[PDB]
């Protein structure tokens, strides 16, 4: 990955990446995008210097996106779920969809829908957690029931077996870097196995996935640009537009729209989908519209907290008004309400940012910048 | 409608067995997995017969501080007429709690008021000094009885004057004197008591108490 090349070089204190004399240079555009990507992941600071998080990611042998997710994953014993999600994403999708099954027989589609509703319990608006469900459900399926489980649930056995092996290997890498006894850690099947995550654990997981994919977050068109795209309760979910955070503003906004994939759990939801959605990537497949590979839905403040480490989030001046006193402790320390802006700056009309809900925050003045410390 | 009429939830949850094997590192050193991650004592204090009834009426106010602040297990055996205190290994935390509790019961046993006895639990530098009249001087018969009256004074005024001046508490049990207070304080009280035993009139002792009482405030 180009970001891996940049991440490694920055850990070597090599400053000039663009003009570096590579034997086989990557494209300058890719290097610039790669540098920008690392900043969003908090690996490189505003001056393009490696940070403490950045040094750790350089140690990992995985791509920086997955490396970032694992680093912030050692909280509230949610690591076993993240390892399952990262492993499942790396190997691939194990779900055989109705289109592949050619059933888009009436009894078989009912079983297919039942099998999908079987794995849909973790969260209504998230597809990545469904991917977590099958992987975790696998560990409790004994050897003699594997083929029945795959056949019953329309899953790919060989892809599933690869996932389980990757979980053990992936967990070893994380514990080795994080744990004090770096070399000595040994993985066990019992560590991989875990019970259903609690509701608070589910919310933390969505934040954890957001850390990997901050830049890959989309908002509905109705929120940012009401009436630019006609919306009604009658409109199906797959027809609801979304806009990525960093999409360039075309003369016509309809081009920048993205739409939910039919296979996603969001399709059968019926009700209005989440305003903010986190996607793995975009696919031009489908002549009508571009599709978004959804992972989970993030709320406003959770997005602000994750984007806080990166440079994709900008903060306003202290809000003042009814019950909005800016408590000030020292000349360089204050507490105030601020309306966060995520994405492009208001001055920057090329890229398409937006404003998040106001939140109380603690700010400390560093180098003339009221840098944020934590949300109150 | 009233007759007087005209005409997203942001979530608050924010992200903030040993292995029996060895691994050799690149220098060749071994590397092993991490290993898996107040004693029971008792004291016995025997209560004399004349302190049974005061202990009976004052028990409601005796076990709470011992059981709550000191985390001790309190019982008294009616058969032996003694108070038992035990350190509970699972709750007790202060190693000196048991000995501190025993002293508090001992002070009440000697004859001190309960509220004064609590000072032993509250503070850590209060002691009890004890001595007899015969140690100072061999007084017998009426001479001994007059000496006790001289220490107490009329209406106990002389005893209270010493207690107020020296910041102590005195129990005058027949020819046996017990003084409760700080180390420097009980020595000051002891001197005044001993002067009274040797024969000094109370009025002269009262004057010296006023002198030392003045000094005590400036320091």
């Amino acid at each position: 990955p180009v970001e891996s090349i940049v991440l490694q070089m920055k850990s070597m204190a090599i400053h000039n990446i663009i003009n570096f004399p590579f034997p086989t240079p990557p494209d300058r555009v890719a290097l610039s995008k790669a540098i920008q990507l690392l900043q969003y992941l908090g690996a490189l600071d505003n001056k393009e210097m490696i940070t403490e998080d950045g040094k750790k990611m350089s140690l990992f042998p995985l791509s920086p996106r997955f490396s970032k997710m694992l680093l912030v994953s050692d909280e509230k014993a949610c690591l076993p779920y993240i390892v399952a999600i990262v492993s499942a994403l790396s190997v691939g999708d194990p779900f055989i969809n109705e289109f592949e099954l050619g059933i888009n027989k009436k009894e078989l589609r009912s079983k297919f829908y039942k099998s999908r509703s079987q794995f849909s319990k973790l969260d209504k608006f998230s597809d990545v957690f469904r991917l977590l469900s099958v992987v975790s459900a696998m560990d409790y399926v004994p050897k003699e029931q594997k083929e029945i489980f795959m056949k019953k649930n329309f899953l790919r056995g060989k892809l599933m077996e690869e996932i389980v092996k990757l979980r053990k290997q992936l967990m070893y890498i994380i514990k080795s870097n994080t744990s004090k006894e770096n070399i000595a850690v040994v993985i066990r099947n019992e560590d991989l196995k875990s019970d259903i995550p609690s509701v608070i654990q589910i919310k933390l997981l969505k934040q954890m996935i957001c850390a990997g994919f901050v830049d890959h977050v989309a908002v509905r068109a109705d929120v940012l640009f009401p009436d630019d795209a006609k919306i009604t309760n009658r409109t199906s979910i797959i027809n609801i537009p979304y806009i990525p955070v960093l999409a360039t503003r075309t003369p016509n906004i309809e081009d920048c729209f993205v739409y939910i994939h039919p296979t996603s759990i969001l399709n059968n939801l019926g009700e209005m989908p989440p305003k903010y959605m986190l996607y793995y990537s975009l696919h031009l497949g489908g002549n009508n519209k571009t599709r978004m590979n959804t992972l989970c839905d993030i709320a406003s403040t959770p997005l602000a907290n994750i984007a806080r480490k990166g440079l994709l989030l900008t903060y306003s001046k202290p809000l003042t008004g009814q019950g909005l006193k800016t408590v000030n402790l020292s000349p360089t320390e204050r507490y105030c309400y601020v309306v966060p802006r995520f994405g492009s700056t208001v001055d920057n009309d090329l890229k398409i940012g937006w404003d998040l809900n106001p939140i109380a925050v603690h700010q400390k003045k560093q180098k003339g910048q009221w840098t944020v410390i934590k949300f109150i | 409608v009233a007759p007087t009429a005209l005409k997203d939830d942001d979530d608050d949850v924010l992200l903030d067995h040993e292995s029996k094997t060895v691994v050799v590192d690149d220098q060749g050193k071994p590397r092993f997995t991490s290993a898996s991650k107040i004693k029971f004592e008792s004291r016995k204090i025997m209560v004399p017969p004349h302190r049974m009834t005061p202990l009976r009426n004052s028990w409601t106010k005796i076990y709470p501080p011992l059981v709550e602040h000191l985390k001790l297990q309190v019982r008294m055996n009616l058969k032996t007429k003694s108070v038992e205190l035990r350190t509970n290994p699972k709750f007790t935390t202060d190693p000196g709690a048991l000995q501190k509790g025993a002293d508090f019961i001992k002070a009440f046993t000697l004859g001190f008021d309960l509220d004064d006895s609590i000072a032993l639990l509250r503070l850590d530098d209060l002691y009890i000094e004890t001595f007899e009249v015969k140690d100072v001087k061999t007084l017998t018969g009426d001479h001994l009885s007059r000496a006790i009256g001289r220490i107490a004074g009329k209406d106990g005024k002389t005893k209270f004057a010493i207690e107020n001046a020296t910041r102590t508490r005195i129990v005058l049990a027949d020819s046996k004197i017990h003084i409760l207070g700080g180390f420097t304080h009980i020595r000051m009280a002891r001197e005044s008591v001993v002067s009274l035993i040797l024969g000094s009139p109370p009025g002269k002792v009262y004057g010296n108490l006023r002198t030392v009482a003045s000094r005590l405030k400036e320091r």
């Binding site: 079987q118 469900s133 975790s136 459900a137 409790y140 399926v141 019970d195 259903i196 | 028990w59 409601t60 076990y63 059981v67 297990q73 309190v74 019982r75 008294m76 055996n77 009616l78 035990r86």
Partner: peptide
């Protein structure tokens, strides 16, 4: 699977 009276008078107190 899941994914599918005087206290302490004569007795210790």
């Amino acid at each position: 699977n899941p994914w599918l009276t005087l206290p302490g008078w004569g007795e210790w107190a």
